[PDB]
């Protein structure tokens, strides 16, 4: 890897600089290099990894949605034939997106998840695994779509089982996991009632635990809790 000659600490330092500079592709490459050093990631380092790749894949997903919408309109009755270019370019962006997802899933499988013994780190990585299979599922159409969907479901479910056993209901990773698994149910699994049930139960159990928190923890938790409410408002 091109980051193999750079010190781990220098890679983390540069990931933070890349974030400040809004250079998220660079950020992700620095954090991939850090992961490939083979040591476990600290809490802050996990956050850098997550933020980096979320921003990269976020741009790709937004572009894919623009192009897929154009492609869909091109295939409506009465639409002029424009040739293969829209499909080709949608496929180009899709393949790049799938590559990023495969890269993240590869870091998680080699070997972040297996070395993660603490509940917080294990849940963090399993949530990421669910998320990146979910992004693969958003673009999937072939023989493998059902298995991609079930890979997302399985990772999210394992994360949920651990987080319920080992973390308080206000834990921000637990909350973000439940938020994203609820969106998985709504958007990917065609299970809107499961999505709504999960969002509501997650919100109510967190509400009931806020009294235990410091002011700073209360801010972290209520920020994600508002996203659960926002989704419930969209969906009901």
């Amino acid at each position: 890897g091109a980051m193999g000659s750079m010190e781990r600490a220098s890679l983390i330092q540069k990931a933070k600089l890349a974030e400040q500079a809004e250079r998220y592709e660079d950020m992700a490459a620095f954090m991939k290099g850090a992961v490939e050093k083979g040591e476990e990631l600290s809490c802050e380092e996990r956050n850098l990894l997550s933020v980096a790749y979320k921003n990269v894949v976020g741009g790709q997903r937004a572009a894919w949605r623009v192009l897929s919408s154009i492609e869909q309109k091109s295939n409506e009755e009465g639409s002029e034939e424009k040739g293969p270019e829209v499909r080709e370019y949608r496929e180009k962006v899709e393949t790049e997106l799938q590559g990023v997802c495969d890269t993240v899933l590869g870091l998680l499988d080699s070997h972040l998840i297996k070395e993660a013994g603490d509940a917080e780190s294990r849940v963090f990585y399993l949530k990421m695994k669910g998320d990146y299979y979910r992004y693969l599922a958003e673009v999937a159409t072939g023989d493998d779509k059902k298995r991609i969907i079930d890979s997302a479901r399985s990772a999210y479910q394992e994360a949920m089982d651990i987080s319920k056993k080992e973390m308080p209901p206000t834990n921000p990773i637990r909350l973000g996991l439940a938020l994203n698994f609820s969106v998985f149910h709504y958007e990917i699994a065609n299970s809107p009632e499961e999505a709504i049930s999960l969002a509501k139960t997650t919100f109510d159990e967190a509400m009931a635990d806020l009294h235990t928190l410091s002011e700073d923890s209360y801010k972290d938790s209520t920020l994600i809790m508002q996203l659960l409410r926002d989704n419930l408002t969209l969906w009901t």
Binding site: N180, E187, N231
Partner: peptide, 10 residues
């Protein structure tokens, strides 16, 4: 709106 997930890209 698009459904919210977390973390949110900048």
């Amino acid at each position: 709106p698009r459904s919210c997930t977390w973390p949110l890209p900048r």
